[PDB]
Amino acid sequence: GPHMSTDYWLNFTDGGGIVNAVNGSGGNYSVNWSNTGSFVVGKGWTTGSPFRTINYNAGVWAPNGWGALALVGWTRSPLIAYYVVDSWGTYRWTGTYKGTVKSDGGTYDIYTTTRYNAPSIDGDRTTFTQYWSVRQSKRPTGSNATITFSNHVNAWKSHGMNLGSNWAYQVMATAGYQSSGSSNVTVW
């Protein structure tokens, strides 16, 4: 797989509440958020790859409510958002259950959902399918961790979940919805 450090900084908020993101040095970033709408912040790559290995270390992981410490990315053709969720806050991300995949010392549940009239890389009010791998139990944080994304791509394919042909961003993110928290993450 590719061996390139990060080149992309993502800082998205729909404007609800407070999302105080810091674009740190190298692969490092932090977020403190409060009473938010929908947001996603992270570091990664402008063009995703199905062969990338993402390394990270979350030195601070302190979400509440809906929060996700997750690989986040998109394809176009078709427009699909995907997620590999290693940890979360109060509520565990789920959807339509498809199966499981083992990767990087964890077992992940595979889900699909669909969003309507929602923000995406194509506009503020769009419809798109979402593919999820969600760890069955929260991954420990504070030590170096790996996501071998190809294992997820392959398992998704085995359940009829095919990604699009045009790769957009691919980041190791802090995402949340209607919540509050803190994170500090370094990505490579």
Short mmCIF file of N, CA and C in Angstrom, two decimals:
data_model
loop_
_atom_site.label_atom_id
_atom_site.label_comp_id
_atom_site.label_asym_id
_atom_site.label_seq_id
_atom_site.Cartn_x
_atom_site.Cartn_y
_atom_site.Cartn_z
N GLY A 1 0.83 -1.24 0.00
CA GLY A 1 0.00 0.00 0.00
C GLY A 1 0.85 1.26 0.00
N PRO A 2 0.21 2.41 -0.19
CA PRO A 2 0.96 3.67 -0.22
C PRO A 2 1.59 3.97 1.14
N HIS A 3 2.72 4.69 1.09
CA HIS A 3 3.44 5.15 2.28
C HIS A 3 3.64 6.65 2.12
N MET A 4 2.60 7.43 2.40
CA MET A 4 2.68 8.88 2.34
C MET A 4 2.04 9.45 3.60
N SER A 5 2.70 10.44 4.23
CA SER A 5 2.11 11.11 5.37
C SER A 5 0.92 11.94 4.92
N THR A 6 0.22 12.51 5.89
CA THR A 6 -1.02 13.18 5.56
C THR A 6 -0.77 14.46 4.75
N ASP A 7 -1.75 14.80 3.92
CA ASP A 7 -1.72 16.03 3.16
C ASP A 7 -2.98 16.85 3.25
N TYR A 8 -3.98 16.42 4.03
CA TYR A 8 -5.29 17.05 4.02
C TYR A 8 -5.80 17.28 5.43
N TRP A 9 -6.37 18.47 5.63
CA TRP A 9 -7.04 18.89 6.86
C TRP A 9 -8.51 19.12 6.57
N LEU A 10 -9.36 18.42 7.30
CA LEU A 10 -10.81 18.51 7.21
C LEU A 10 -11.35 19.17 8.47
N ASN A 11 -12.13 20.22 8.30
CA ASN A 11 -12.79 20.89 9.43
C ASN A 11 -14.18 21.29 8.96
N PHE A 12 -15.16 20.42 9.17
CA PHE A 12 -16.53 20.65 8.75
C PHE A 12 -17.44 20.77 9.97
N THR A 13 -18.27 21.80 9.97
CA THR A 13 -19.38 21.88 10.91
C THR A 13 -20.59 22.45 10.20
N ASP A 14 -21.77 21.95 10.56
CA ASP A 14 -22.99 22.56 10.06
C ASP A 14 -23.36 23.84 10.78
N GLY A 15 -22.54 24.30 11.73
CA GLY A 15 -22.76 25.56 12.40
C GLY A 15 -23.44 25.46 13.74
N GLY A 16 -23.85 24.27 14.17
CA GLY A 16 -24.46 24.13 15.47
C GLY A 16 -23.42 24.13 16.58
N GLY A 17 -23.74 24.85 17.65
CA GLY A 17 -22.90 24.83 18.83
C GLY A 17 -21.48 25.31 18.56
N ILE A 18 -20.53 24.74 19.29
CA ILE A 18 -19.13 25.15 19.24
C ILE A 18 -18.29 23.95 18.80
N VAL A 19 -17.50 24.13 17.75
CA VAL A 19 -16.53 23.12 17.31
C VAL A 19 -15.20 23.84 17.18
N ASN A 20 -14.35 23.74 18.20
CA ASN A 20 -13.07 24.45 18.23
C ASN A 20 -11.98 23.46 17.84
N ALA A 21 -11.69 23.44 16.55
CA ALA A 21 -10.70 22.54 15.98
C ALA A 21 -9.36 23.24 15.88
N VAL A 22 -8.29 22.50 16.13
CA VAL A 22 -6.93 23.00 16.00
C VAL A 22 -6.20 22.12 15.01
N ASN A 23 -5.70 22.74 13.94
CA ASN A 23 -4.86 22.08 12.96
C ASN A 23 -3.43 22.14 13.50
N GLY A 24 -2.98 21.05 14.11
CA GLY A 24 -1.66 21.02 14.72
C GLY A 24 -0.56 20.74 13.73
N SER A 25 0.61 20.44 14.28
CA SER A 25 1.81 20.15 13.52
C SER A 25 1.76 18.75 12.92
N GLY A 26 2.21 18.61 11.67
CA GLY A 26 2.28 17.28 11.08
C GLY A 26 0.91 16.64 10.99
N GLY A 27 0.80 15.42 11.50
CA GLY A 27 -0.45 14.70 11.51
C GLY A 27 -1.33 14.95 12.71
N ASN A 28 -0.97 15.91 13.58
CA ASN A 28 -1.67 16.11 14.84
C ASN A 28 -2.80 17.13 14.71
N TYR A 29 -3.89 16.87 15.42
CA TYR A 29 -4.96 17.85 15.53
C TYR A 29 -5.70 17.63 16.83
N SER A 30 -6.51 18.60 17.20
CA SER A 30 -7.36 18.46 18.37
C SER A 30 -8.70 19.13 18.11
N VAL A 31 -9.68 18.72 18.91
CA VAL A 31 -11.02 19.29 18.87
C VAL A 31 -11.54 19.37 20.29
N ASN A 32 -12.16 20.51 20.62
CA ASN A 32 -13.04 20.63 21.77
C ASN A 32 -14.38 21.12 21.24
N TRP A 33 -15.46 20.41 21.58
CA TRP A 33 -16.75 20.71 21.00
C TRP A 33 -17.81 20.70 22.08
N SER A 34 -18.89 21.45 21.81
CA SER A 34 -19.96 21.62 22.78
C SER A 34 -21.29 21.82 22.09
N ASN A 35 -22.28 21.02 22.50
CA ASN A 35 -23.68 21.20 22.09
C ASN A 35 -23.81 21.41 20.59
N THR A 36 -23.19 20.52 19.84
CA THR A 36 -23.01 20.72 18.41
C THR A 36 -24.26 20.35 17.61
N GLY A 37 -24.19 20.67 16.33
CA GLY A 37 -24.92 19.95 15.30
C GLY A 37 -24.08 18.79 14.82
N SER A 38 -23.97 18.63 13.50
CA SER A 38 -23.14 17.62 12.87
C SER A 38 -21.79 18.24 12.50
N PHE A 39 -20.70 17.53 12.83
CA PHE A 39 -19.36 18.00 12.51
C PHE A 39 -18.45 16.82 12.25
N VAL A 40 -17.38 17.09 11.50
CA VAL A 40 -16.32 16.11 11.31
C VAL A 40 -15.01 16.85 11.09
N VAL A 41 -13.99 16.45 11.84
CA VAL A 41 -12.68 17.09 11.81
C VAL A 41 -11.62 16.00 11.73
N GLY A 42 -10.59 16.19 10.92
CA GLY A 42 -9.51 15.23 10.98
C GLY A 42 -8.42 15.50 9.98
N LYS A 43 -7.43 14.63 9.99
CA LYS A 43 -6.31 14.68 9.08
C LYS A 43 -6.21 13.39 8.29
N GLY A 44 -5.78 13.52 7.04
CA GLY A 44 -5.65 12.37 6.18
C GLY A 44 -5.19 12.77 4.81
N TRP A 45 -5.88 12.28 3.79
CA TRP A 45 -5.45 12.36 2.41
C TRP A 45 -6.56 12.92 1.52
N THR A 46 -6.17 13.74 0.55
CA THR A 46 -7.14 14.32 -0.37
C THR A 46 -7.79 13.26 -1.25
N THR A 47 -7.07 12.18 -1.54
CA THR A 47 -7.57 11.10 -2.39
C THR A 47 -7.43 9.78 -1.64
N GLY A 48 -8.55 9.19 -1.30
CA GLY A 48 -8.51 7.92 -0.61
C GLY A 48 -8.02 6.80 -1.51
N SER A 49 -7.56 5.75 -0.85
CA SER A 49 -7.18 4.51 -1.50
C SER A 49 -7.78 3.32 -0.77
N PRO A 50 -8.26 2.31 -1.49
CA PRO A 50 -8.73 1.08 -0.84
C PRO A 50 -7.60 0.23 -0.29
N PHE A 51 -6.35 0.63 -0.52
CA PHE A 51 -5.18 -0.11 -0.08
C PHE A 51 -4.43 0.60 1.03
N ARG A 52 -4.95 1.70 1.54
CA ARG A 52 -4.19 2.44 2.52
C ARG A 52 -4.28 1.81 3.90
N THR A 53 -3.17 1.87 4.60
CA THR A 53 -3.10 1.56 6.01
C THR A 53 -3.00 2.88 6.75
N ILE A 54 -3.95 3.12 7.63
CA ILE A 54 -3.99 4.34 8.41
C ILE A 54 -3.47 4.05 9.81
N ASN A 55 -2.50 4.83 10.25
CA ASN A 55 -1.97 4.72 11.60
C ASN A 55 -2.40 5.94 12.38
N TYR A 56 -2.71 5.76 13.66
CA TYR A 56 -3.05 6.92 14.45
C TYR A 56 -2.79 6.63 15.93
N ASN A 57 -2.77 7.70 16.71
CA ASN A 57 -2.70 7.60 18.16
C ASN A 57 -3.59 8.70 18.70
N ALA A 58 -4.66 8.33 19.38
CA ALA A 58 -5.57 9.29 20.00
C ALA A 58 -5.12 9.51 21.42
N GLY A 59 -4.34 10.58 21.62
CA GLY A 59 -3.86 10.88 22.96
C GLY A 59 -4.95 11.34 23.90
N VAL A 60 -6.00 11.96 23.38
CA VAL A 60 -7.19 12.32 24.15
C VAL A 60 -8.40 11.79 23.40
N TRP A 61 -9.24 11.02 24.08
CA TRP A 61 -10.52 10.59 23.52
C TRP A 61 -11.55 10.71 24.63
N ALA A 62 -12.35 11.78 24.60
CA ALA A 62 -13.29 12.09 25.67
C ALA A 62 -14.59 12.63 25.09
N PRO A 63 -15.30 11.82 24.30
CA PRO A 63 -16.60 12.24 23.77
C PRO A 63 -17.74 11.98 24.74
N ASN A 64 -18.86 12.62 24.45
CA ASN A 64 -20.14 12.32 25.06
C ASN A 64 -21.18 12.25 23.93
N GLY A 65 -22.35 11.67 24.20
CA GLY A 65 -23.39 11.65 23.18
C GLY A 65 -22.97 10.85 21.97
N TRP A 66 -23.28 11.37 20.79
CA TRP A 66 -22.84 10.79 19.51
C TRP A 66 -21.46 11.37 19.17
N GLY A 67 -20.44 10.52 19.24
CA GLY A 67 -19.10 10.89 18.83
C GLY A 67 -18.46 9.66 18.22
N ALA A 68 -17.55 9.89 17.28
CA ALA A 68 -16.89 8.79 16.60
C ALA A 68 -15.43 9.12 16.39
N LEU A 69 -14.56 8.19 16.77
CA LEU A 69 -13.14 8.17 16.44
C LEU A 69 -13.06 7.17 15.30
N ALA A 70 -12.92 7.66 14.06
CA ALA A 70 -13.23 6.83 12.91
C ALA A 70 -12.45 7.27 11.68
N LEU A 71 -12.09 6.30 10.86
CA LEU A 71 -11.76 6.59 9.48
C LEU A 71 -13.05 7.02 8.79
N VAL A 72 -13.01 8.16 8.10
CA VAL A 72 -14.14 8.72 7.36
C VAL A 72 -13.66 9.01 5.95
N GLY A 73 -14.45 8.64 4.95
CA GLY A 73 -14.11 9.04 3.60
C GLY A 73 -15.30 8.91 2.69
N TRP A 74 -15.07 9.31 1.44
CA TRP A 74 -16.11 9.31 0.43
C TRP A 74 -15.60 8.75 -0.89
N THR A 75 -16.53 8.20 -1.66
CA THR A 75 -16.37 8.05 -3.09
C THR A 75 -17.48 8.83 -3.79
N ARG A 76 -17.24 9.10 -5.07
CA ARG A 76 -18.26 9.46 -6.03
C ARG A 76 -18.39 8.33 -7.05
N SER A 77 -19.48 8.35 -7.81
CA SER A 77 -19.74 7.38 -8.88
C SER A 77 -19.81 5.95 -8.35
N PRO A 78 -20.71 5.65 -7.39
CA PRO A 78 -21.67 6.58 -6.80
C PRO A 78 -21.17 7.26 -5.53
N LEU A 79 -21.92 8.29 -5.13
CA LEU A 79 -21.64 9.03 -3.91
C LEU A 79 -21.95 8.15 -2.69
N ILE A 80 -20.92 7.79 -1.94
CA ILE A 80 -21.03 6.94 -0.77
C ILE A 80 -20.09 7.49 0.29
N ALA A 81 -20.58 7.59 1.53
CA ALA A 81 -19.75 7.89 2.68
C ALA A 81 -19.45 6.57 3.39
N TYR A 82 -18.21 6.42 3.87
CA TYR A 82 -17.84 5.23 4.61
C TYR A 82 -17.13 5.60 5.91
N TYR A 83 -17.21 4.66 6.85
CA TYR A 83 -16.77 4.86 8.22
C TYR A 83 -16.18 3.56 8.76
N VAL A 84 -15.02 3.66 9.39
CA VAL A 84 -14.49 2.57 10.22
C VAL A 84 -14.34 3.16 11.62
N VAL A 85 -15.28 2.82 12.50
CA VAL A 85 -15.42 3.44 13.81
C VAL A 85 -14.72 2.57 14.84
N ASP A 86 -13.66 3.11 15.43
CA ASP A 86 -12.91 2.44 16.47
C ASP A 86 -13.40 2.73 17.88
N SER A 87 -13.86 3.95 18.15
CA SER A 87 -14.43 4.27 19.45
C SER A 87 -15.53 5.31 19.26
N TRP A 88 -16.28 5.52 20.34
CA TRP A 88 -17.45 6.37 20.31
C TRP A 88 -17.69 6.90 21.72
N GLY A 89 -18.81 7.59 21.89
CA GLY A 89 -19.20 8.16 23.17
C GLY A 89 -20.26 7.32 23.87
N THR A 90 -21.40 7.97 24.13
CA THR A 90 -22.47 7.35 24.88
C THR A 90 -23.17 6.28 24.04
N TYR A 91 -23.47 6.59 22.78
CA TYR A 91 -24.34 5.79 21.92
C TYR A 91 -23.53 5.12 20.82
N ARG A 92 -23.73 3.83 20.64
CA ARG A 92 -23.00 3.08 19.63
C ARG A 92 -23.68 3.20 18.27
N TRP A 93 -22.90 3.61 17.27
CA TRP A 93 -23.35 3.71 15.89
C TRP A 93 -23.78 2.35 15.35
N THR A 94 -24.97 2.31 14.75
CA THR A 94 -25.50 1.11 14.14
C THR A 94 -26.31 1.48 12.90
N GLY A 95 -26.97 0.49 12.33
CA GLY A 95 -27.75 0.65 11.14
C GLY A 95 -28.33 -0.71 10.77
N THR A 96 -28.51 -0.95 9.49
CA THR A 96 -28.97 -2.26 9.02
C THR A 96 -27.80 -3.23 9.11
N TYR A 97 -27.92 -4.27 9.93
CA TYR A 97 -26.81 -5.19 10.17
C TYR A 97 -26.58 -6.10 8.97
N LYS A 98 -25.32 -6.19 8.54
CA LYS A 98 -24.93 -7.01 7.40
C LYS A 98 -24.05 -8.20 7.76
N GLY A 99 -23.16 -8.05 8.73
CA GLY A 99 -22.19 -9.09 9.01
C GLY A 99 -21.07 -8.54 9.86
N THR A 100 -19.96 -9.27 9.90
CA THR A 100 -18.81 -8.86 10.71
C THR A 100 -17.52 -9.01 9.92
N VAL A 101 -16.49 -8.30 10.37
CA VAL A 101 -15.14 -8.42 9.83
C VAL A 101 -14.15 -8.30 10.98
N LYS A 102 -13.11 -9.13 10.93
CA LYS A 102 -11.99 -9.02 11.86
C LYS A 102 -10.87 -8.23 11.20
N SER A 103 -10.34 -7.24 11.92
CA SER A 103 -9.22 -6.48 11.40
C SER A 103 -8.48 -5.82 12.55
N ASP A 104 -7.15 -5.79 12.47
CA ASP A 104 -6.36 -4.99 13.40
C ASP A 104 -6.71 -5.27 14.86
N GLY A 105 -6.87 -6.55 15.18
CA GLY A 105 -7.11 -6.99 16.54
C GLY A 105 -8.52 -6.82 17.04
N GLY A 106 -9.41 -6.27 16.22
CA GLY A 106 -10.79 -6.05 16.59
C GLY A 106 -11.75 -6.84 15.73
N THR A 107 -12.99 -6.96 16.21
CA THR A 107 -14.08 -7.47 15.40
C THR A 107 -15.07 -6.33 15.24
N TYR A 108 -15.46 -6.08 13.99
CA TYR A 108 -16.33 -4.98 13.64
C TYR A 108 -17.64 -5.51 13.09
N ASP A 109 -18.72 -4.86 13.47
CA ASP A 109 -20.01 -5.07 12.83
C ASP A 109 -20.12 -4.18 11.60
N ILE A 110 -20.73 -4.72 10.56
CA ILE A 110 -20.92 -4.03 9.30
C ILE A 110 -22.38 -3.61 9.20
N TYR A 111 -22.61 -2.33 8.93
CA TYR A 111 -23.96 -1.79 8.81
C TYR A 111 -24.05 -0.92 7.56
N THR A 112 -25.27 -0.78 7.04
CA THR A 112 -25.59 0.27 6.08
C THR A 112 -26.68 1.17 6.63
N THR A 113 -26.61 2.44 6.22
CA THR A 113 -27.67 3.41 6.46
C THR A 113 -27.79 4.27 5.21
N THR A 114 -28.85 5.05 5.13
CA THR A 114 -29.03 6.01 4.06
C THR A 114 -29.42 7.33 4.69
N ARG A 115 -28.80 8.41 4.22
CA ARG A 115 -29.12 9.76 4.65
C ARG A 115 -29.85 10.49 3.53
N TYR A 116 -30.83 11.32 3.91
CA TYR A 116 -31.64 12.10 2.99
C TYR A 116 -31.55 13.57 3.35
N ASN A 117 -31.45 14.40 2.32
CA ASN A 117 -31.45 15.85 2.48
C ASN A 117 -30.45 16.30 3.54
N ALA A 118 -29.24 15.77 3.42
CA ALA A 118 -28.19 15.91 4.41
C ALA A 118 -26.92 16.42 3.74
N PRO A 119 -26.02 17.05 4.50
CA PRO A 119 -24.77 17.52 3.91
C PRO A 119 -23.88 16.38 3.46
N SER A 120 -23.23 16.59 2.32
CA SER A 120 -22.23 15.69 1.80
C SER A 120 -21.20 16.52 1.05
N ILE A 121 -20.22 15.85 0.46
CA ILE A 121 -19.27 16.54 -0.39
C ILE A 121 -19.91 17.11 -1.66
N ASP A 122 -21.16 16.77 -1.94
CA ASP A 122 -21.87 17.25 -3.12
C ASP A 122 -22.91 18.33 -2.82
N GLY A 123 -23.07 18.75 -1.58
CA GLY A 123 -24.01 19.82 -1.28
C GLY A 123 -24.56 19.71 0.12
N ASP A 124 -25.39 20.70 0.47
CA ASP A 124 -25.95 20.77 1.81
C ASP A 124 -27.13 19.83 1.99
N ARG A 125 -27.83 19.50 0.91
CA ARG A 125 -29.07 18.72 0.98
C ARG A 125 -29.01 17.63 -0.07
N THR A 126 -28.48 16.47 0.33
CA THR A 126 -28.23 15.38 -0.59
C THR A 126 -28.62 14.05 0.04
N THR A 127 -28.79 13.05 -0.82
CA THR A 127 -29.08 11.68 -0.41
C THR A 127 -27.86 10.82 -0.71
N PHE A 128 -27.48 9.97 0.25
CA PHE A 128 -26.32 9.10 0.05
C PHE A 128 -26.40 7.91 0.97
N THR A 129 -25.89 6.79 0.48
CA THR A 129 -25.71 5.62 1.32
C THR A 129 -24.41 5.72 2.13
N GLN A 130 -24.44 5.14 3.32
CA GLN A 130 -23.30 5.09 4.22
C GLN A 130 -22.97 3.63 4.51
N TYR A 131 -21.69 3.31 4.41
CA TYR A 131 -21.16 2.01 4.79
C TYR A 131 -20.39 2.14 6.09
N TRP A 132 -20.63 1.23 7.02
CA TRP A 132 -20.03 1.29 8.33
C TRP A 132 -19.38 -0.03 8.70
N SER A 133 -18.19 0.06 9.30
CA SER A 133 -17.66 -0.95 10.21
C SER A 133 -17.56 -0.30 11.58
N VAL A 134 -18.17 -0.91 12.59
CA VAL A 134 -18.17 -0.34 13.93
C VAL A 134 -17.62 -1.41 14.88
N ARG A 135 -16.55 -1.09 15.59
CA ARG A 135 -15.94 -2.09 16.46
C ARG A 135 -16.97 -2.57 17.47
N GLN A 136 -16.93 -3.86 17.82
CA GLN A 136 -17.93 -4.42 18.73
C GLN A 136 -17.78 -3.87 20.14
N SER A 137 -16.56 -3.56 20.55
CA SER A 137 -16.28 -2.87 21.80
C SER A 137 -15.28 -1.76 21.48
N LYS A 138 -15.30 -0.72 22.30
CA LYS A 138 -14.46 0.44 22.03
C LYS A 138 -12.99 0.05 22.00
N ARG A 139 -12.28 0.50 20.98
CA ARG A 139 -10.85 0.26 20.91
C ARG A 139 -10.15 1.08 21.99
N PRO A 140 -9.17 0.52 22.68
CA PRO A 140 -8.36 1.35 23.58
C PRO A 140 -7.74 2.50 22.80
N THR A 141 -7.52 3.61 23.49
CA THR A 141 -6.86 4.76 22.92
C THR A 141 -5.61 5.09 23.72
N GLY A 142 -4.72 5.84 23.10
CA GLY A 142 -3.52 6.34 23.74
C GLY A 142 -2.25 5.64 23.32
N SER A 143 -2.36 4.54 22.58
CA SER A 143 -1.24 3.85 21.98
C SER A 143 -1.43 3.86 20.46
N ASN A 144 -0.38 3.51 19.74
CA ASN A 144 -0.47 3.52 18.28
C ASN A 144 -1.42 2.42 17.82
N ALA A 145 -2.27 2.77 16.87
CA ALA A 145 -3.31 1.90 16.33
C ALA A 145 -3.25 1.94 14.81
N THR A 146 -3.68 0.85 14.19
CA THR A 146 -3.73 0.73 12.74
C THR A 146 -5.13 0.36 12.29
N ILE A 147 -5.54 0.93 11.15
CA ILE A 147 -6.71 0.49 10.40
C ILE A 147 -6.22 0.03 9.03
N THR A 148 -6.35 -1.26 8.77
CA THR A 148 -6.02 -1.86 7.48
C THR A 148 -7.28 -1.79 6.64
N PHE A 149 -7.43 -0.68 5.92
CA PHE A 149 -8.71 -0.38 5.28
C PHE A 149 -9.12 -1.46 4.28
N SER A 150 -8.16 -2.10 3.61
CA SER A 150 -8.53 -3.12 2.62
C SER A 150 -9.36 -4.24 3.23
N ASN A 151 -9.13 -4.59 4.50
CA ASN A 151 -9.95 -5.63 5.11
C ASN A 151 -11.41 -5.23 5.15
N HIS A 152 -11.69 -3.95 5.40
CA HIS A 152 -13.05 -3.44 5.42
C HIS A 152 -13.62 -3.40 4.01
N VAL A 153 -12.86 -2.87 3.06
CA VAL A 153 -13.32 -2.84 1.68
C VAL A 153 -13.74 -4.23 1.23
N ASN A 154 -12.89 -5.22 1.50
CA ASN A 154 -13.17 -6.59 1.05
C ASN A 154 -14.40 -7.16 1.73
N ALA A 155 -14.54 -6.96 3.04
CA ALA A 155 -15.71 -7.49 3.73
C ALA A 155 -16.98 -6.82 3.24
N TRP A 156 -16.94 -5.50 3.04
CA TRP A 156 -18.10 -4.80 2.51
C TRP A 156 -18.49 -5.39 1.16
N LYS A 157 -17.51 -5.60 0.28
CA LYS A 157 -17.80 -6.17 -1.03
C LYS A 157 -18.52 -7.50 -0.89
N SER A 158 -18.13 -8.31 0.09
CA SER A 158 -18.72 -9.64 0.26
C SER A 158 -20.19 -9.57 0.66
N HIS A 159 -20.66 -8.42 1.12
CA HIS A 159 -22.06 -8.20 1.46
C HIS A 159 -22.75 -7.25 0.49
N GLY A 160 -22.20 -7.12 -0.72
CA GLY A 160 -22.83 -6.33 -1.75
C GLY A 160 -22.66 -4.84 -1.59
N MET A 161 -21.72 -4.41 -0.76
CA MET A 161 -21.48 -3.00 -0.48
C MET A 161 -20.23 -2.59 -1.25
N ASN A 162 -20.44 -2.11 -2.48
CA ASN A 162 -19.37 -1.71 -3.38
C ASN A 162 -19.20 -0.20 -3.34
N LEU A 163 -17.96 0.25 -3.24
CA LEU A 163 -17.67 1.68 -3.24
C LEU A 163 -17.64 2.21 -4.67
N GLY A 164 -17.74 3.54 -4.80
CA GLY A 164 -17.65 4.19 -6.09
C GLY A 164 -16.24 4.18 -6.64
N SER A 165 -16.13 4.64 -7.89
CA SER A 165 -14.86 4.58 -8.60
C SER A 165 -14.01 5.83 -8.44
N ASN A 166 -14.59 6.92 -7.97
CA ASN A 166 -13.90 8.19 -7.84
C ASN A 166 -13.65 8.40 -6.35
N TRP A 167 -12.38 8.46 -5.96
CA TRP A 167 -12.03 8.57 -4.55
C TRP A 167 -11.86 10.03 -4.13
N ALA A 168 -12.60 10.43 -3.10
CA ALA A 168 -12.48 11.74 -2.49
C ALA A 168 -11.71 11.60 -1.18
N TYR A 169 -11.90 12.50 -0.21
CA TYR A 169 -10.99 12.50 0.93
C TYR A 169 -11.12 11.23 1.76
N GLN A 170 -10.10 11.00 2.58
CA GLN A 170 -10.00 9.84 3.47
C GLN A 170 -9.22 10.30 4.70
N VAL A 171 -9.89 10.44 5.83
CA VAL A 171 -9.25 11.04 7.00
C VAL A 171 -9.50 10.18 8.22
N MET A 172 -8.63 10.34 9.20
CA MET A 172 -8.83 9.77 10.53
C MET A 172 -9.41 10.87 11.42
N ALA A 173 -10.70 10.75 11.69
CA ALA A 173 -11.53 11.85 12.15
C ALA A 173 -12.06 11.68 13.57
N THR A 174 -12.43 12.84 14.11
CA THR A 174 -13.38 13.00 15.20
C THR A 174 -14.66 13.55 14.58
N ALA A 175 -15.75 12.80 14.69
CA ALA A 175 -17.04 13.22 14.19
C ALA A 175 -18.06 13.20 15.32
N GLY A 176 -19.10 14.01 15.20
CA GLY A 176 -20.09 13.97 16.24
C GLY A 176 -21.40 14.57 15.78
N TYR A 177 -22.40 14.38 16.62
CA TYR A 177 -23.75 14.88 16.36
C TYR A 177 -24.40 15.21 17.69
N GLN A 178 -24.79 16.47 17.86
CA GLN A 178 -25.55 16.91 19.02
C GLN A 178 -24.88 16.51 20.32
N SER A 179 -23.58 16.78 20.43
CA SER A 179 -22.85 16.29 21.58
C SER A 179 -21.77 17.28 21.97
N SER A 180 -20.92 16.83 22.89
CA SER A 180 -19.83 17.62 23.46
C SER A 180 -18.66 16.69 23.73
N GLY A 181 -17.44 17.22 23.73
CA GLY A 181 -16.31 16.38 24.05
C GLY A 181 -14.98 17.04 23.71
N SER A 182 -13.94 16.21 23.82
CA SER A 182 -12.58 16.58 23.47
C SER A 182 -11.88 15.41 22.81
N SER A 183 -11.00 15.72 21.86
CA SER A 183 -10.11 14.73 21.28
C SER A 183 -8.78 15.39 20.93
N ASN A 184 -7.77 14.54 20.81
CA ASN A 184 -6.45 14.92 20.34
C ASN A 184 -5.91 13.68 19.65
N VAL A 185 -5.59 13.79 18.36
CA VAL A 185 -5.27 12.63 17.53
C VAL A 185 -4.09 12.98 16.64
N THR A 186 -3.20 12.01 16.43
CA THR A 186 -2.13 12.14 15.46
C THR A 186 -2.26 11.02 14.44
N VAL A 187 -2.12 11.36 13.16
CA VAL A 187 -2.41 10.46 12.05
C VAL A 187 -1.20 10.37 11.13
N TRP A 188 -0.93 9.18 10.60
CA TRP A 188 0.13 9.00 9.60
C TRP A 188 -0.12 7.77 8.75
#
